[PDB]
Enzyme design. Structure first.
Site, PDB file in Angstrom:
ATOM      1  N   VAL B  41      41.086  59.005  26.182  1.00  0.00           N
ATOM      2  CA  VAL B  41      39.931  58.128  26.035  1.00  0.00           C
ATOM      3  C   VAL B  41      39.898  57.077  27.139  1.00  0.00           C
ATOM      4  O   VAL B  41      38.860  56.846  27.758  1.00  0.00           O
ATOM      5  CB  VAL B  41      39.933  57.440  24.646  1.00  0.00           C
ATOM      6  CG1 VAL B  41      38.992  56.232  24.609  1.00  0.00           C
ATOM      7  CG2 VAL B  41      39.551  58.437  23.569  1.00  0.00           C
ATOM      8  N   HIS B 444      48.531  26.773  45.523  1.00  0.00           N
ATOM      9  CA  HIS B 444      47.273  26.040  45.451  1.00  0.00           C
ATOM     10  C   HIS B 444      46.280  26.609  46.469  1.00  0.00           C
ATOM     11  O   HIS B 444      46.675  26.960  47.584  1.00  0.00           O
ATOM     12  CB  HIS B 444      47.523  24.565  45.753  1.00  0.00           C
ATOM     13  CG  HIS B 444      46.272  23.747  45.844  1.00  0.00           C
ATOM     14  ND1 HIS B 444      45.696  23.143  44.747  1.00  0.00           N
ATOM     15  CD2 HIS B 444      45.487  23.435  46.902  1.00  0.00           C
ATOM     16  CE1 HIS B 444      44.608  22.496  45.125  1.00  0.00           C
ATOM     17  NE2 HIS B 444      44.461  22.655  46.428  1.00  0.00           N
TER      18      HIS B 444
HETATM   19  C1  LIG Z   1      35.175  51.615  25.239  1.00  0.00           C
HETATM   20  C2  LIG Z   1      36.683  51.435  25.174  1.00  0.00           C
HETATM   21  C3  LIG Z   1      37.284  50.509  26.018  1.00  0.00           C
HETATM   22  C4  LIG Z   1      38.673  50.309  25.991  1.00  0.00           C
HETATM   23  N1  LIG Z   1      39.182  49.396  26.835  1.00  0.00           N
HETATM   24  C5  LIG Z   1      40.523  49.156  26.861  1.00  0.00           C
HETATM   25  C6  LIG Z   1      41.116  48.156  27.790  1.00  0.00           C
HETATM   26  O1  LIG Z   1      40.418  47.544  28.541  1.00  0.00           O
HETATM   27  N2  LIG Z   1      42.517  47.927  27.794  1.00  0.00           N
HETATM   28  C7  LIG Z   1      43.360  48.662  26.905  1.00  0.00           C
HETATM   29  O2  LIG Z   1      44.539  48.474  26.905  1.00  0.00           O
HETATM   30  N3  LIG Z   1      42.781  49.636  26.001  1.00  0.00           N
HETATM   31  C8  LIG Z   1      41.349  49.871  25.988  1.00  0.00           C
HETATM   32  N4  LIG Z   1      40.797  50.795  25.130  1.00  0.00           N
HETATM   33  C9  LIG Z   1      41.741  51.511  24.253  1.00  0.00           C
HETATM   34  C10 LIG Z   1      42.465  52.672  24.885  1.00  0.00           C
HETATM   35  O3  LIG Z   1      41.454  53.517  25.369  1.00  0.00           O
HETATM   36  C11 LIG Z   1      43.403  53.374  23.949  1.00  0.00           C
HETATM   37  O4  LIG Z   1      44.293  52.441  23.417  1.00  0.00           O
HETATM   38  C12 LIG Z   1      44.185  54.454  24.669  1.00  0.00           C
HETATM   39  O5  LIG Z   1      43.321  55.394  25.222  1.00  0.00           O
HETATM   40  C13 LIG Z   1      45.245  55.174  23.815  1.00  0.00           C
HETATM   41  O6  LIG Z   1      45.983  56.126  24.520  1.00  0.00           O
HETATM   42  P1  LIG Z   1      46.513  57.252  23.638  1.00  0.00           P
HETATM   43  O7  LIG Z   1      47.334  58.213  24.536  1.00  0.00           O
HETATM   44  O8  LIG Z   1      47.454  56.621  22.585  1.00  0.00           O
HETATM   45  O9  LIG Z   1      45.380  58.010  22.840  1.00  0.00           O
HETATM   46  P2  LIG Z   1      44.164  58.570  23.671  1.00  0.00           P
HETATM   47  O10 LIG Z   1      43.865  57.705  24.894  1.00  0.00           O
HETATM   48  O11 LIG Z   1      42.868  58.580  22.741  1.00  0.00           O
HETATM   49  O12 LIG Z   1      44.453  60.009  24.175  1.00  0.00           O
HETATM   50  C14 LIG Z   1      44.707  60.874  23.180  1.00  0.00           C
HETATM   51  C15 LIG Z   1      44.434  62.335  23.493  1.00  0.00           C
HETATM   52  O13 LIG Z   1      45.107  63.216  22.577  1.00  0.00           O
HETATM   53  C16 LIG Z   1      44.297  64.345  22.454  1.00  0.00           C
HETATM   54  N5  LIG Z   1      44.541  65.145  21.206  1.00  0.00           N
HETATM   55  C17 LIG Z   1      44.236  64.769  19.951  1.00  0.00           C
HETATM   56  N6  LIG Z   1      44.619  65.741  19.091  1.00  0.00           N
HETATM   57  C18 LIG Z   1      45.172  66.726  19.809  1.00  0.00           C
HETATM   58  C19 LIG Z   1      45.728  67.946  19.475  1.00  0.00           C
HETATM   59  N7  LIG Z   1      45.792  68.371  18.058  1.00  0.00           N
HETATM   60  N8  LIG Z   1      46.208  68.741  20.444  1.00  0.00           N
HETATM   61  C20 LIG Z   1      46.154  68.349  21.734  1.00  0.00           C
HETATM   62  N9  LIG Z   1      45.622  67.172  22.091  1.00  0.00           N
HETATM   63  C21 LIG Z   1      45.127  66.351  21.149  1.00  0.00           C
HETATM   64  C22 LIG Z   1      42.879  63.830  22.576  1.00  0.00           C
HETATM   65  O14 LIG Z   1      42.026  64.760  23.143  1.00  0.00           O
HETATM   66  C23 LIG Z   1      42.990  62.712  23.476  1.00  0.00           C
HETATM   67  O15 LIG Z   1      42.709  63.057  24.806  1.00  0.00           O
HETATM   68  C24 LIG Z   1      39.462  51.025  25.136  1.00  0.00           C
HETATM   69  C25 LIG Z   1      38.853  51.960  24.283  1.00  0.00           C
HETATM   70  C26 LIG Z   1      37.481  52.164  24.298  1.00  0.00           C
HETATM   71  C27 LIG Z   1      36.925  53.184  23.346  1.00  0.00           C
HETATM   72  C1  LIG Z   2      40.991  24.127  56.706  1.00  0.00           C
HETATM   73  C2  LIG Z   2      42.294  23.893  55.941  1.00  0.00           C
HETATM   74  C3  LIG Z   2      42.526  24.684  54.824  1.00  0.00           C
HETATM   75  C4  LIG Z   2      43.693  24.538  54.060  1.00  0.00           C
HETATM   76  N1  LIG Z   2      43.835  25.342  52.998  1.00  0.00           N
HETATM   77  C5  LIG Z   2      44.945  25.253  52.215  1.00  0.00           C
HETATM   78  C6  LIG Z   2      45.124  26.133  51.030  1.00  0.00           C
HETATM   79  O1  LIG Z   2      44.286  26.932  50.742  1.00  0.00           O
HETATM   80  N2  LIG Z   2      46.287  26.021  50.226  1.00  0.00           N
HETATM   81  C7  LIG Z   2      47.288  25.056  50.562  1.00  0.00           C
HETATM   82  O2  LIG Z   2      48.271  24.957  49.894  1.00  0.00           O
HETATM   83  N3  LIG Z   2      47.111  24.201  51.714  1.00  0.00           N
HETATM   84  C8  LIG Z   2      45.926  24.313  52.543  1.00  0.00           C
HETATM   85  N4  LIG Z   2      45.759  23.509  53.645  1.00  0.00           N
HETATM   86  C9  LIG Z   2      46.831  22.537  53.921  1.00  0.00           C
HETATM   87  C10 LIG Z   2      46.743  21.236  53.158  1.00  0.00           C
HETATM   88  O3  LIG Z   2      45.536  20.662  53.573  1.00  0.00           O
HETATM   89  C11 LIG Z   2      47.907  20.309  53.367  1.00  0.00           C
HETATM   90  O4  LIG Z   2      49.091  20.976  53.044  1.00  0.00           O
HETATM   91  C12 LIG Z   2      47.804  19.067  52.498  1.00  0.00           C
HETATM   92  O5  LIG Z   2      46.614  18.374  52.732  1.00  0.00           O
HETATM   93  C13 LIG Z   2      49.010  18.110  52.638  1.00  0.00           C
HETATM   94  O6  LIG Z   2      49.012  17.026  51.759  1.00  0.00           O
HETATM   95  P1  LIG Z   2      49.601  15.752  52.350  1.00  0.00           P
HETATM   96  O7  LIG Z   2      49.417  14.625  51.305  1.00  0.00           O
HETATM   97  O8  LIG Z   2      51.105  16.038  52.589  1.00  0.00           O
HETATM   98  O9  LIG Z   2      48.940  15.309  53.714  1.00  0.00           O
HETATM   99  P2  LIG Z   2      47.404  14.964  53.659  1.00  0.00           P
HETATM  100  O10 LIG Z   2      46.669  15.929  52.725  1.00  0.00           O
HETATM  101  O11 LIG Z   2      46.808  15.135  55.134  1.00  0.00           O
HETATM  102  O12 LIG Z   2      47.151  13.514  53.159  1.00  0.00           O
HETATM  103  C14 LIG Z   2      47.598  12.555  53.992  1.00  0.00           C
HETATM  104  C15 LIG Z   2      46.819  11.246  54.007  1.00  0.00           C
HETATM  105  O13 LIG Z   2      47.646  10.149  54.433  1.00  0.00           O
HETATM  106  C16 LIG Z   2      46.836   9.253  55.125  1.00  0.00           C
HETATM  107  N5  LIG Z   2      47.580   8.356  56.084  1.00  0.00           N
HETATM  108  C17 LIG Z   2      48.118   8.688  57.273  1.00  0.00           C
HETATM  109  N6  LIG Z   2      48.710   7.597  57.818  1.00  0.00           N
HETATM  110  C18 LIG Z   2      48.555   6.576  56.969  1.00  0.00           C
HETATM  111  C19 LIG Z   2      48.939   5.243  56.974  1.00  0.00           C
HETATM  112  N7  LIG Z   2      49.697   4.664  58.106  1.00  0.00           N
HETATM  113  N8  LIG Z   2      48.612   4.454  55.937  1.00  0.00           N
HETATM  114  C20 LIG Z   2      47.929   4.958  54.895  1.00  0.00           C
HETATM  115  N9  LIG Z   2      47.549   6.239  54.861  1.00  0.00           N
HETATM  116  C21 LIG Z   2      47.845   7.060  55.875  1.00  0.00           C
HETATM  117  C22 LIG Z   2      45.756  10.102  55.762  1.00  0.00           C
HETATM  118  O14 LIG Z   2      44.531   9.459  55.792  1.00  0.00           O
HETATM  119  C23 LIG Z   2      45.607  11.227  54.879  1.00  0.00           C
HETATM  120  O15 LIG Z   2      44.544  11.045  53.980  1.00  0.00           O
HETATM  121  C24 LIG Z   2      44.637  23.614  54.401  1.00  0.00           C
HETATM  122  C25 LIG Z   2      44.406  22.813  55.530  1.00  0.00           C
HETATM  123  C26 LIG Z   2      43.256  22.946  56.294  1.00  0.00           C
HETATM  124  C27 LIG Z   2      43.139  22.031  57.478  1.00  0.00           C
END
Ligand SMILES: Cc1cc2nc3c(=O)[nH]c(=O)nc-3n(C[C@H](O)[C@H](O)[C@H](O)COP(=O)(O)OP(=O)(O)OC[C@H]3O[C@@H](n4cnc5c(N)ncnc54)[C@H](O)[C@@H]3O)c2cc1C
Ligand SMILES: Cc1cc2nc3c(=O)[nH]c(=O)nc-3n(C[C@H](O)[C@H](O)[C@H](O)COP(=O)(O)OP(=O)(O)OC[C@H]3O[C@@H](n4cnc5c(N)ncnc54)[C@H](O)[C@@H]3O)c2cc1C
Ligand SMILES: COc1ccc(NC(=O)CN(C)S(=O)(=O)c2cc(Br)cnc2N)cc1
Ligand SMILES: COc1ccc(NC(=O)CN(C)S(=O)(=O)c2cc(Br)cnc2N)cc1
EC number: 1.8.1.4
Lengths: 465, 465
Positions: B41, B444
Site C-alpha cells: 500500500v 543557525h
Molecule cells: C493514503 C495513505 C497514506 C499513508 N501515509 C503514510 C505515511 O505517510 N507514513 C507512514 O509511515 N505510513 C503511511 N500509511 C500507512 C502505510 O501505508 C502502512 O503502514 C504500510 O503500507 C504497511 O506496510 P505493510 O507491509 O505492513 O502492509 P502493506 O503495506 O499493506 O503491504 C501488505 C501487502 O501484503 C499483501 N498480501 C495480503 N495478503 C496476502 C496473501 N494472502 N498472500 C500474499 N500477499 C498478501 C498485500 O497485497 C499487500 O501488498 C499510509 C496509508 C495510506 C492508505
Molecule cells: C551575508 C552573510 C550571511 C551570513 N549567513 C550566516 C548563516 O546563514 N548562518 C550563520 O551561522 N552565520 C552567517 N553569517 C555570519 C554571521 O553573520 C556572524 O557569524 C555573526 O554575525 C557573528 O556574531 P558576532 O556577535 O560574533 O559579530 P557581529 O554579528 O558582527 O556583531 C558584532 C557587533 O559588535 C559591534 N561593535 C564592534 N566594535 C564595537 C565597539 N568598539 N563598541 C561597541 N560595539 C562594537 C558591531 O557594531 C557589531 O554590531 C553570515 C554573514 C554574512 C555577512
C-alpha cells in the site's frame, strides 16, 4: 554619566546579546554597548535577511525549472524589489525581538562605541555626541569581524561588501563574486535565479573548499546547471572600477585574463574587528592572525576579560557566537559549564538549494590523521520524500572509525538537509556509535531516513540501497 | 510444483520486503509472495504518492495565496491531472526500486496469493494461472490491513476508500471525509488546495485525537483558515449514494443533521487482513480486535511464524513495519537485536502544511501517569528560519520528568517539522537528559533551533523567548 556593572558586553550581535541575556539570568548586572546594529551583522544584514532572499530565489528556481513537472501553467514573474522588501520586514521583526529580550532581562542598553581605557574601565562615545564611562568587573568582547578585501583592492561604488549588496533593492545586470565560501555561493544563487549574470572566482581548486570534496563537486554541478560560471584555482590580482563597468584581472596557470561586470562582490573572508577600541590599553593579546586569543572558556590573557564570536576567529558563525557567549557568562558567574571542545565538530550549513550541511572531519582529513576510516553514502534518489518533494539530488555521507563505529564526520547535500544535523552532533558528543544509531527508528517518509540507512551502512549492510 | 525456503515472507509492503532483505543479509534463503502491490500500500497507493500530491498542494497554496507576499505576479493555475501523473511516476519508480533490491539480495519473488495449508506449508495461486506449493522453516506474515468502514455503510460509485481516491485523475466539486486521522487530514489538505470544498467528520472531539491537545487545536486553527470545515464530536450513522449526490446523516448530540456532497471518503481506520488465507490451518491466534497476536519479537503463538507490520495492529506506519521486519528476521537468524519496546515512543507525523510530528507521551498523559512533569514550549514566531521561509506558525512542545530531565514526549507543529524528530527519539532511547541535549549546538538559522530552546527551557530558562 558613570556607572558600575558586573558585566559589560561590547557588541550586540548573536554573541553579545545572548551572552548578556545569560549573565542577566545568572543574576549579574549587565550592560551591552552597541553603536549601530542590535542583533549585529546576522540579524540586520547577514543570516536573517539572506535566508529570506534565498527562499524567494528557491521559489523562482522551482518555477523556471520545474513548472512543467508540477503542472504549472502561466507566465509568472518575480519582482526582486518585493523579495528585498520582505527581507527587510523579516530583519526588522527580529531586531525588535532583540530589544524585547533585553528588556525582559533588565539589561541596560548603551547606544555608542566603546573603547577600553584600562583593564576595568570603558569609554563610550555616545551616538548623540555625548560620553559615558562604564567600570566593570568583567568584560565580554563581542565586536565581530569585517570583510577582508582582496589585497591591493579597495571598495567603491561598484565594488562592494555583502553589506551594500544585501541592502540593494535594485539589481545589477552582471556581477563578479570574489570568493566561493558560504556567502559567495548564497549570493550567487539568489542573483542568478533573479536574472543576473553571475561569475564566481575561487583561489582554491574547489567551491566550498572547506567541505568534503564529494560535496564540492555536487554543488558545483548544480550551479553550472543553474547557469552560474565558477572559476576555480584562479587568483584575483586587481579590481578596477571604471564607473560604467568593473574590470577584474585574474590569473590561472600563469595566464592573466580580464573579466568584466557591472559590479564586484568581495566575499573572500572576514577579518576580526580588533583595532580602534583600545585592546592594547586593556592588555588583550592578539594571535598570529590578528584575532583575539582565548582559552577553552573564552577567557583572554586578562583573567576577567572574555572574547566571543567572530572576533576570536575560531569559527565565524552565529550559533558558535551564541554558544561561546553562554560559556563566557557561566564561567563569570561560577555556574556549571561545558566547553565547546573541538570547533571542527561544530555544525555548519549553506542555504542555497540544494542545501549543504556538515560537521567534523572530511573523508580525506580522517585518513590523513590515521583513523581506521569507514564510509557510508546514501543518494537521495533512493529516498521516498526527496522524489515526493521534486528534488532527488544529493546524498548523505558519514565517515566513522571502524574500531567502534564512532562518528568523525557528516556531509550532506540535498533539499533542506541543514535540519538533519542535530542527531549526528548529538551522537558525536555523547559517544553514541553507528550501532546505537542504527537502532533509532526514523519516520517514513522523511529525508532523515537517509541518515538511518547510512548508520546501517557503517555497521554492515544498508537495506534500501 | 514444489519448492522450499528457509524463510517465506507473505506480502511485499515495507514490512515484508525489508524483512526479506534482512533475512537474505543474514544468510537465510528467502522467498517473498505478493500478487498485486510490490511495495504494498505504502509505495503504490499510500505514503509515497500521497507525499508527492501534498508537495504539489503546498506549491498551489504558495503560488496563489502567498503570491503577493513573495512578489509573484502573472495569471497562474495548477492542473491536478499533472499532480496525479507525477505521483504515479514517483510510485512506479519506488516500486521498481523494490524489484532491484530483491534482485540484489537474491530473493525469490513468487507472484501470486498465498494460503496456508498447515504450519509449514503454503499454497500459492500464481498470477500466470498456475499454482505451486511452498514449504518453509520460518514464515513472516506481512499481509497488511484494509480500510474499516463506518458501521452499517458500503463502498459504492461515490463512496470510496483512499485507494480509489488517490488513483482518481479528476477532482470532485465536493467531498465529505469520515475520520480526522493522518490520512483524512492529508486528503483534506490536498483536495482543498485544489479547490474542492471539503468537510471532515470526526467522532472524537478533536482533529488528530491521538496527539497532544495543543497540537490538535493548532492544526484545527490552521485547517480552518485554509477553508476546510471540520466537524468534531460527530457521528456518521448512514451514507446514501444517490448517484448525483451522497447524503451523509450525521449526529452531533443530541441532533441529527444531513450533509451532502459529490463524494465521500472513508478514512476512520484500518483492520488487519486476517481472513481468507489459512491462518486457521496454521494455528495462528487472533487478538480481541482481530489482529495477529505477537510478542516483543513479533513471534506468533506458533513459534516459527512471525507477524509484522499493520497485520499486528500495534502501530500502522511504514517505518514501524520496516523496524519489525528487521527484528523478526534477526530473531529468526539467531542474530543480535533490540525489541522496539513501547510503541507509543515511536515517532509519527502528518504531512500536510504545517506538518504535525510527535513521539512519546502527551503532557496530560504524563501527568495522569504520575510523572513530575516539566513542559517547555517554543513558538516558531520567535524562530528566524520560520519567518524567512514564510511560515512562522506552530511551535515545539517538549515534556520531561523533573528528576533527571528525561524526555517523555515531543510534539511539533510547523513547516517540515517531521525532519526534527531524530534527535529527540535518540535522546529518549538512550536516556540522554535535557541537560545534555542543551549542549548540542544547532546550526543557525534552522527550525531545529526551536528544539535547543526547549531543552534550555526544561533545564531552567530559554534564551530567545
Ligand atoms: C493514503 C495513505 C497514506 C499513508 N501515509 C503514510 C505515511 O505517510 N507514513 C507512514 O509511515 N505510513 C503511511 N500509511 C500507512 C502505510 O501505508 C502502512 O503502514 C504500510 O503500507 C504497511 O506496510 P505493510 O507491509 O505492513 O502492509 P502493506 O503495506 O499493506 O503491504 C501488505 C501487502 O501484503 C499483501 N498480501 C495480503 N495478503 C496476502 C496473501 N494472502 N498472500 C500474499 N500477499 C498478501 C498485500 O497485497 C499487500 O501488498 C499510509 C496509508 C495510506 C492508505
Ligand atoms: C551575508 C552573510 C550571511 C551570513 N549567513 C550566516 C548563516 O546563514 N548562518 C550563520 O551561522 N552565520 C552567517 N553569517 C555570519 C554571521 O553573520 C556572524 O557569524 C555573526 O554575525 C557573528 O556574531 P558576532 O556577535 O560574533 O559579530 P557581529 O554579528 O558582527 O556583531 C558584532 C557587533 O559588535 C559591534 N561593535 C564592534 N566594535 C564595537 C565597539 N568598539 N563598541 C561597541 N560595539 C562594537 C558591531 O557594531 C557589531 O554590531 C553570515 C554573514 C554574512 C555577512
Ligand atoms: C513575545 O515577544 C517576543 C519577541 C521576540 C522573541 N524572540 C526572537 O525574536 C528571537 N530572536 C531575536 S531570533 O531572531 O529569532 C534568533 C536569533 C538567533 Br542569532 C538565534 N535564535 C533566534 N531565535 C520572543 C518573544
Ligand atoms: C540502483 O537502483 C536503485 C534505486 C533505488 C533503490 N532504493 C529505493 O528505491 C528505496 N525504496 C524503494 S523507497 O521507496 O525509496 C523506501 C521505502 C521505505 Br518503506 C523506506 N525507505 C525507502 N528508501 C535501490 C536501487
Amino acid at each position: 554619566s558613570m556607572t558600575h556593572y558586573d558585566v559589560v558586553v561590547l557588541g550586540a550581535g548573536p554573541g553579545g546579546y545572548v551572552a548578556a541575556i545569560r549573565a542577566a539570568q545568572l543574576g549579574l548586572s549587565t550592560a551591552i554597548v552597541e553603536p549601530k546594529y542590535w542583533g549585529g551583522v546576522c540579524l540586520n544584514v547577514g543570516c536573517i535577511p539572506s535566508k529570506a532572499l534565498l527562499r524567494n530565489a528557491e521559489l523562482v528556481h522551482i518555477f523556471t525549472k520545474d513548472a512543467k513537472a508540477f503542472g504549472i501553467s502561466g507566465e509568472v514573474t518575480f519582482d526582486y524589489g518585493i523579495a528585498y522588501d520582505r527581507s527587510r520586514k523579516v530583519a526588522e521583526g527580529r531586531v525588535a525581538g532583540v530589544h524585547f529580550l533585553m528588556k525582559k532581562n533588565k539589561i541596560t542598553e548603551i547606544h555608542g562605541y566603546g573603547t577600553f581605557a584600562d583593564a576595568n574601565t570603558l569609554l563610550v562615545d555616545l551616538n548623540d555626541g555625548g560620553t559615558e564611562s562604564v567600570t566593570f568587573d568583567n568584560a565580554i568582547i563581542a565586536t565581530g569581524s569585517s570583510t577582508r578585501l582582496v589585497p591591493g583592492t579597495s571598495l567603491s561604488a561598484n565594488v562592494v561588501t555583502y553589506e551594500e549588496q544585501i541592502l540593494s533593492r535594485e539589481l545589477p545586470k552582471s556581477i563578479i563574486i570574489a570568493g566561493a565560501g558560504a556567502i559567495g555561493m548564497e549570493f550567487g544563487y539568489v542573483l542568478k535565479n533573479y536574472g543576473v549574470d553571475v561569475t564566481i572566482v575561487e583561489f582554491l581548486p574547489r567551491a566550498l573548499p572547506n567541505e568534503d570534496a564529494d560535496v564540492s563537486k555536487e554543488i558545483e554541478k548544480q550551479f553550472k546547471k543553474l547557469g552560474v560560471t565558477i572559476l576555480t584555482a584562479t587568483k584575483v590580482e586587481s579590481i578596477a572600477d571604471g564607473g560604467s563597468q568593473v574590470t577584474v584581472t585574474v590569473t590561472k596557470d600563469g595566464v592573466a585574463q580580464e573579466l568584466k561586470a557591472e559590479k564586484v562582490l568581495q566575499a573572500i573572508g572576514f577579518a576580526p574587528n580588533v583595532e580602534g577600541y583600545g585592546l592594547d590599553k586593556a592588555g588583550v593579546a592578539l594571535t598570529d592572525r590578528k584575532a583575539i586569543g582565548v582559552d577553552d572558556y573564552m577567557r583572554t590573557n586578562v583573567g576577567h576579560i572574555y572574547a566571543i564570536g567572530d572576533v576570536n576567529g575560531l569559527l565565524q558563525l552565529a550559533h558558535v557566537a551564541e554558544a561561546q557567549g553562554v560559556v563566557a557568562a557561566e564561567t563569570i558567574a561560577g555556574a556549571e559549564t561545558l566547553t565547546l571542545g573541538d570547533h571542527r565538530m561544530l555544525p555548519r550549513a549553506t542555504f542555497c538549494q540544494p542545501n549543504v550541511a556538515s560537521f567534523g572531519l572530511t573523508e580525506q582529513q580522517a585518513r590523513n590523521e590515521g583513523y581506521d576510516v569507514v564510509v557510508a553514502k546514501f543518494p537521495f534518489t533512493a529516498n521516498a520524500k526527496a522524489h515526493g518533494v521534486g528534488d532527488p539530488s544529493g546524498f548523505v555521507k558519514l565517515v566513522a572509525d571502524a574500531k567502534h563505529g564512532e562518528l568523525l564526520g557528516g556531509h550532506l547535500v540535498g533539499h533542506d538537509v541543514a535540519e538533519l544535523l542535530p542527531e549526528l552532533t548529538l551522537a558525536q558528543r555523547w559517544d553514541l556509535t553507528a550501532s546505537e544509531l542504527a537502532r533509532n527508528v526514523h519516520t517514513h517518509p522523511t529525508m532523515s531516513e537517509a541518515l538511518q540507512e547510512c548508520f546501517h551502512g557503517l555497521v554492515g549492510h544498508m537495506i534500501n540501497f
